[PDB]
Design a protein around this ligand. Structure first.
Ligand SMILES: Nc1ccn([C@H]2C[C@H](O)[C@@H](COP(=O)(O)O)O2)c(=O)n1
Ligand SMILES: Nc1ccn([C@H]2C[C@H](O)[C@@H](COP(=O)(O)O)O2)c(=O)n1
Ligand SMILES: Nc1ccn([C@H]2C[C@H](O)[C@@H](COP(=O)(O)O)O2)c(=O)n1
Ligand SMILES: [Cl-]
Ligand SMILES: [Cl-]
Ligand SMILES: [Mg+2]
Ligand SMILES: [Mg+2]
Ligand SMILES: [Mg+2]
Ligand SMILES: [Mg+2]
Ligand code: NA
Ligand code: NA
Ligand code: NA
Ligand code: NA
Lengths: 554, 243, 61, 61, 61, 61, 62, 61
DNA sequence: CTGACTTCAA
DNA sequence: CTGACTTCAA
DNA sequence: CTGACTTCAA
């Protein structure tokens, strides 16, 4: 029937305390969604090629990093993506979880579409002309669920296109599009390259060996929803690894038995002494010196490691910045060397509704981790047999230039990843961060993904697609390319239920622990005012810290 | 989806006990909120003239406070006039010695949603049509998480006339905001400074709640209805006699 | 006059309330809230603050 | 001397939108909540200052 | 065949190509949503975008 | 998963776009003054994020 | 001899113990040199504060 | 004749209830009493100077 | 009424 | 289909 | 009378 609702709206976050410290967290999320007609009903093979010889074109010397050229299959379908922390938790929920829990893991997911409404638009009068909206009671909306994951995975969180983060504000799905293989090659140059230097900037034709054109219609069963219909996905069970809600601080210099002091400090302002390093017990892996020091001591393994930056590698697909594992930026504040992430988002995902201009909000996330990062400027390599102190020919440091390039140092191309490397898992970023991810279908997989905390061990939740069915008008001739449609749009509710499994943290230190808190200090990053509505209701939800409590590594 | 009933029935148990059942029904009107946002609004009547708190001795005129204005409305029937005819009150007061609350239940039905459009131009008239698929949202704070706001105190409960339409009251609640006002009389010195301040939100006392994040919400289309179920009161009997 | 009231959630409570004859000993009847759901129009862009809605109202018993 | 004192407590609910006030430690010099105050000194001197309680607010009515 | 440049949601074009020989445009990289691991620049580009992992790698030779 | 070594390059950080010759290391740059030796000959970008296919089965040899 | 740096200061990155080879590259192949006292191997007769020192080269030859 | 224990344990019952068991242990020192008698002692600070109760307005002392 | 690229976590 | 600040007067 | 940071490899 047309006069009865097909679902219930619910946004509540409930905490079921099992006992033994286990907690079942059930995050209910509901949104009103708006869906319009596609600008085209065709699947299009679109190309973007920013090869201008001015501005930010790839045809100007040294502009490789500006490359945007690629090819995509544009589809008339839309994607309903809720894979972002902000969709499921209120800021206070995140705080409660981060301050009191030690671990968190994905449990299950289910989604539902209901209370579908389809309307048509018509013109009124002439002077004026106003628009009139009517119900198309017999019109329908199409829904498809890629449960087998046949179609390319496209996490909307990476382009800030997931559903909004405000339960009381309408949202919309994102238009679905996916990459298509297209040969692409770009020459490398610097702003100092010769004047008559030719920049090779090419794009090729489709290749038989790598072409994959998929349509929703030929691969997924499609459900038609009229105003009285509803759609449910059923429950999906996640298979992922638990995420630690704690952060580590022990570096290589903090592993094991500290050297024994000779005597306790003589006063509260005094320092202590060790026994002369020439008479000290211990071990090192520098056999040319007869002493041990904290810097030379052998430690079990290597916490963290040096990563090349800003490394750009090249493929048939063009140049690309190689991702880096997110680690502590250190006191040296080496953002790029330690993979700090800078994201740009809009008003549905955190930006102040009052902010003006086309520019999005920007935020740089630095790893909570304090023990695995690298302070590149203070790093160095000495020749062996080691000499202490070394002369300039026996040491390679930040001041030394590679291939005579003033700003290029051994650390830019240095990679110390090895069998002894140990490091933490990337932080979960509230509320902009992605939550789960699909694993790459390659025989040899990565140990982690930089973009999300939970990579699905098994098949991930399939994507949910929607679109309006064509609304034809009396004039229709298949043999012509003339397109005559009735202006239509729809709205419907979406409800998702995401369940987590968490565990309350133990408490054993003497000193109080660090906790995410709010405050009343003017201009403070944690001022309550930031999480309250303004006089006219404007909101903004800034990134919140996570993993505030430290845990012992060894 | 429901039946209209306003009758007040008296079930005489015997032994002098009486079960009084007050049925009340009203047609309600609900419009769109002037805003869909939750707003943190401030009122500060600190004018230096008239009834401002900036004029000597006007402390008692203070109206400054802060509130969370919401796009929701409250259906409040907690006032005697909603349940009894004047004669009922008279009968009870003249013949009874005690009265106590027993139970309560509420229901929303025969929902109707309409849209308004403009006609012609000279004139322009309004035309009203049924949105058969549109809905009205309903929420019941059975746990009492949200601030209690008895509409009787601002004369905003449902009307007292069964044959006249009424409307719910817009829901809004107090929010903590530092406020301080000096004391003076009309005879205070001329150059007397009146301290009249309001502060910023305080972390220690800020509580911003939304209906959407705390209560399950039901969507009612024209063919749906909503019932609360029966609630049992636990209160002390009221003496109908005076000393 | 008001008929029932919620008790103040303080450890030490008042012997009565001036505004109502019956203060609930236990949890009082929860409040009933209502509102119209937004009625969107063909033009809608979440990234803008432009608000385009269909003029709507309702009645119910 | 050994004593065993048992308590019964209940985890708090979480319903507000805005983050809540929490007792935390910090690294700001001369701050009342600087960690240094709850750590031993070079010679082992200790001191335990009063800590806040009831940081989270609840609605009275 | 998917390289790092082919992983995930492609950037959204502003409009569909105007003809079969035309190209499409993205929104100015200074106003584009997305993420990178180069915090010194306020824009996102296909080459700078953060991708899940690294497909393939450089080997000494 | 392959690498087009001549089109690979490394820039200094904070990144500068476009970079001048001292802010970029490319194929034209010589290591230890050896004309044909470039950073890519001794570069190894294998890491925790590396993903790649399995070698092909070669028929019939 | 790779020294990396952290909030904790500089430190020599450990190396996997492997054959030092005919070239006798101790540091490149993580040979371990330890210093110990009379309870753990040093000759009880030895005099001086200096501990006993020994460099262990991996049995591994491959 | 006993065991020393200072641990504070948290037994999470479920439903949010928690049984907190605080164990406390101390080494105590006990000396001889300065007297073995029960004494009826009097303190009377009625000096006419300093903080005595014999100086005007010193009642609170 | 999600299951690893179809049906078919039947 | 009202139950004391979630689920859960289950 | 060792069990992954409490109790609680109960
Ligand atoms: N009392 C208990 C004990 C374990 N568990 C479950 C929670 C998890 O699913 C699992 C332990 O997780 P794993 O270990 O990270 O055991 C529970 O729910 N209740
Ligand atoms: N015959 C009777 C006797 C008592 N009662 C009930 C009415 C009240 O619930 C209760 C007495 O109220 P309490 O005493 O104020 O007993 C009744 O309903 N019929
Ligand atoms: N699952 C439960 C439920 C109640 N209880 C106990 C804890 C308290 O002793 C009592 C409730 O306390 P009262 O209400 O403040 O019930 C429990 O221990 N476990
Ligand atoms: Cl940097
Ligand atoms: Cl050596
Ligand atoms: Mg299936
Ligand atoms: Mg299948
Ligand atoms: Mg309930
Ligand atoms: Mg409850
Ligand atoms: Na030592
Ligand atoms: Na850090
Ligand atoms: Na985009
Ligand atoms: Na050997």
């Amino acid at each position: 029937g047309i006069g009865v609702s097909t679902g219930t709206y619910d946004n509540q976050t409930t905490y079921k305390f099992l006992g033994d410290g286990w907690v079942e967290i059930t995050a209910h999320a509901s949104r009103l969604l708006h869906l319009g007609m596609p600008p085209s009903e065709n699947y299009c093979r679109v190309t973007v090629h920013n090869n201008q010889t001015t501005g930010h074109g790839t045809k100007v010397k040294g502009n490789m990093a500006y490359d945007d050229t690629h090819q995509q299959i544009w589809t008339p379908w839309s994607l309903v993506d809720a894979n972002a922390w902000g969709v499921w938790f209120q800021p206070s929920d995140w705080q409660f979880i981060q301050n009191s829990m030690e671990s968190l893991n994905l449990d299950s997911l289910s989604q539902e579409l209901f209370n579908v409404v389809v309307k048509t638009v018509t013109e009124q009068q002439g002077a004026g002309a106003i628009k009139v909206y009517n119900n198309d009671l017999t019109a329908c909306m199409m829904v498809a669920l890629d449960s087998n994951n046949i179609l390319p995975y496209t996490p909307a969180a990476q382009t800030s296109e997931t559903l909004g983060f405000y339960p009381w504000k309408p949202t919309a799905p994102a238009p679905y599009r996916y990459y298509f293989f297209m040969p692409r090659q770009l020459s490398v140059t610097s702003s100092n390259s010769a004047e008559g230097t030719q920049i090779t900037d090419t794009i090729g034709e489709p290749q038989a060996l790598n072409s994959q054109f998929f349509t929703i219609e030929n691969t997924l069963p499609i459900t038609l929803l009229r105003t009285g219909d509803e759609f449910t996905t059923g429950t999906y069970i996640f298979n992922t690894d638990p995420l630690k809600l704690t952060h580590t601080w022990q570096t290589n210099r903090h592993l094991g038995m500290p050297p024994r002091i000779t005597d306790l400090p003589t006063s509260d302002t005094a320092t202590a002494s060790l026994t002369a390093n020439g008479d000290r017990f211990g071990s090192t892996q520098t056999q040319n010196v007869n002493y041990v020091t904290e810097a030379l001591r052998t430690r079990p393994a290597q916490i963290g490691f040096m990563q090349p930056h800003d490394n750009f590698e090249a493929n048939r697909g063009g140049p690309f910045k190689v991702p880096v594992v997110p680690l502590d930026i250190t006191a040296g504040e080496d953002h790029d060397a330690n993979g700090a992430i800078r994201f740009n988002y809009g008003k549905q995902h955190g930006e102040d509704w009052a902010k003006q201009g086309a520019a999005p909000e920007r935020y740089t996330w630095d790893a909570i981790d304090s023990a695995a990062g690298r302070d590149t400027a203070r790093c160095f390599v000495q020749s062996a047999p080691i000499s202490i102190p070394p002369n300039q020919n026996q040491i390679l440091q930040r001041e030394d230039a590679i291939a005579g390039r003033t700003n290029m140092h051994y650390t830019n191309v240095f990679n110390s990843y090895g069998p002894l490397s140990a490091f933490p898992h990337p932080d979960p970023i509230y509320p902009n961060g992605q939550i789960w991810d699909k694993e790459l279908d390659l025989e040899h997989k990565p140990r982690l993904h930089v973009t999300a905390p939970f990579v699905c061990k098994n098949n991930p939740p399939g994507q949910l697609f929607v679109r309006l069915g064509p609304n034809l008008t009396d004039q229709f001739d298949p043999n012509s390319t003339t397109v005559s449609r009735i202006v239509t749009y729809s709205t419907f509710y979406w409800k998702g239920i995401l369940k987590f499994k968490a565990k309350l943290r133990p408490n054993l230190t003497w000193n109080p622990v660090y906790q995410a808190t709010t405050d009343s200090v003017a201009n403070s990053y944690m001022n309550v005012k930031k999480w309250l509505p303004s006089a006219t209701g404007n909101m903004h939800s800034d990134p919140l810290i996570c993993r505030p409590v430290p845990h012992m590594t060894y």
